[PDB]
Amino acid sequence: MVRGIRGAITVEEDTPEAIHQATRELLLKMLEANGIQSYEELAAVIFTVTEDLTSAFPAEAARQIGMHRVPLLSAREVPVPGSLPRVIRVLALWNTDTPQDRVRHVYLREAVRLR
Amino acid sequence: MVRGIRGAITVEEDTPEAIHQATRELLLKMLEANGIQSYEELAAVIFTVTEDLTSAFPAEAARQIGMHRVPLLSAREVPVPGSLPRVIRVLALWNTDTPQDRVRHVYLREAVRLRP
Amino acid sequence: MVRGIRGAITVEEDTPEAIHQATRELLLKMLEANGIQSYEELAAVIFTVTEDLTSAFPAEAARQIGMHRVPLLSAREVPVPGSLPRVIRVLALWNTDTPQDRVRHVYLREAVRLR
């Protein structure tokens, strides 16, 4: 079975370091919250970034924590008026027998308003 | 086994009401057409909207019909000039043994012309 | 299980013919590299294209090679300084027993500069 894991986190400046730092933190927490201690069962990980962020690919933060074998893809989020700014969102596809209602999703910082 | 389910529907205007109503109808039809019993079978659902739609997130319609525990993600479609305007597209990833040739995709309203 | 397969290829110019030819080449190469002789194994295929490519949908290429029954979805890639121009990226979700470490990803033409 495949279960999606959602995550979201905000930053306060479109810089490679800031983008990477937040992404690394989110990915590590999404995995920790679900007791995942290996990357072998992640089918793929998809990232989306709001329009106000274009300095670096979030996928690079995944490479930084050793996810070089995990398929990654990034896309742009819809610029909805009044929507939360500077947000990095993640959708991990996890091969697991963990029930849908047992999967833990992670919303950090300002993204907590998105849960 | 995971099978993707595609859906597409158009709206006549860029308003939250129009977007949510259409997305709600599309999702319900996608579920109905494939006889899906519980949302527990859905690994995730991805939504995309064309550049001319920015008033709201289609994913909100999913919450309206009880998909609170289903992982949702939204993105922007490639802005190809001359393409069908105001389109909401959906890709559901379904855990099922259903063969690929038996999965039912749904194309509504003006998107009916987008069916493969 | 489900394993994602990554692919990427560049195009010399923004025209439907060029986009479709490149996408056909990449898709075929991704399947060949993984010994996939049938499309029944593909859960879905997601494409992303850089903003300098807007003349056509890469998904049309999938139809051309007979992937009508494969669920397809496309999205806009995130702009990044110094990133390779005119890039088509693919993420195929493959139903397979193949371990993550044995899935073959394909980077063609100038896209080799991204791998």
What 8-state DSSP symbol labels residue A114?
A: G
**Burial, B116: exposed, middle or buried (Cβ in 10 Å; 0-12, 13-18, 19+)?**
middle
Query: Among B40, B35, B26, which Cα is nearest to B102's?
Result: B35
Residue-wise burial string across A83-92, b where 16 or more C-beta atoms lie within 10 A, e elsewhere: ebebbbbbbb
Tell me the technique behind this structure. Answer: X-ray
Q: In whole angstroms, what is the distance from residue A31 CA to residue A81 CA? A: 31
CA distance C26 to chain A (A): 16
In chain A, the largest separation of any two C-alpha atoms, in whole Å, equals: 38
**Which amino acid, C92?**
A
Q: How far apart are CA C41 and CA B99, in angstroms?
A: 10
Who's near C69: CB < 8 A, 6+ residues apart? B100, B101, B103, B116, C39, C40
How does DSSP classify residue B103? -
Rounded CA gap, C15 and C27, in Å?
Answer: 18
- Beta strand spans in chain B (E): 2-10, 42-49, 72-76, 87-95, 106-107
- What does DSSP assign to residue B111? G
CB A5 within 8 A of CB A35: no
Tracing tokens 């290429």 back to the chain, one arrives at C61
**Token digits of residue B115:** 């069916």
List CB contacts of C101: < 8 A, sequence separation 6 or more.
Answer: A40, A69
Contact B48, B6 (CB under 8 A): no
Bridge partners of residue C74, in order along the sequence: C47
Tell me which CATH code domain C1-115 carries: 3.30.1330.40
Cα dihedral sign for A109, B64, B67, A83?
negative
Domain ranges of chain C: 1-115
- A51 touches A37 (CB < 8 A): no
Three-class SS of residue B63? helix
- Write the DSSP assignment of C62-84 as a string of letters: HHHTT-TTS-EEEEEPPP-TTPP
3-state helix, strand, coil in chain A (%, to 5): 30, 30, 45
Resolution in A: 1.6
CA distance C61 to chain B (A): 12
At B76, is the secondary structure helix, strand, or coil?
A: strand
Of residues A38, A47, A50, A37, the one with CA closest to residue A91:
A47
Residue B57 to residue A76, Cβ atoms within 8 A: no
B70 is written with which tokens? 């289903």
Q: What is the DSSP string of chain C?
A: -EEEEEEEEE-SSS-HHHHHHHHHHHHHHHHHHTT---GGGEEEEEEEE-TT--SS-THHHHHHTT-TTS-EEEEEPPP-TTPPSSEEEEEEEEE-S--GGGPPPEEEGGGGGT-
Q: Which of residues 44-73 of A touch B (CB under 8 A)?
A: 46, 48
Burial of residue B83 (number of CB atoms within 10 Å: 0-12, 13-18, 19+): middle
Cβ–Cβ < 8 Å for C89, C5: no
- Rounded to whole angstroms, the Cα distance separating A12 from A22 reads 10
Q: Cβ C48–A75 below 8 Å, yes or no?
A: yes
What is the topology classification, in CATH, of domain B1-116?
Answer: 60s Ribosomal Protein L30; Chain: A; (3.30.1330)
Structure tokens at B113: 């012309």
Cβ-based neighbours of B37, under 8 Å, separated by 6 or more: none
- The SS3 of residue A64 is helix
Give chain B positions within 8 Å (CB) of C40. 99-101
Which residue in A72, A69, A75, A68 sits closest to A89, CA to CA? A75
Of the candidates C19, C40, C41, C37, the one whose C-alpha atom is nearest the C-alpha of residue C28 is C37
Task: Give B76 to chain A, closest Cα distance, Å.
Answer: 6
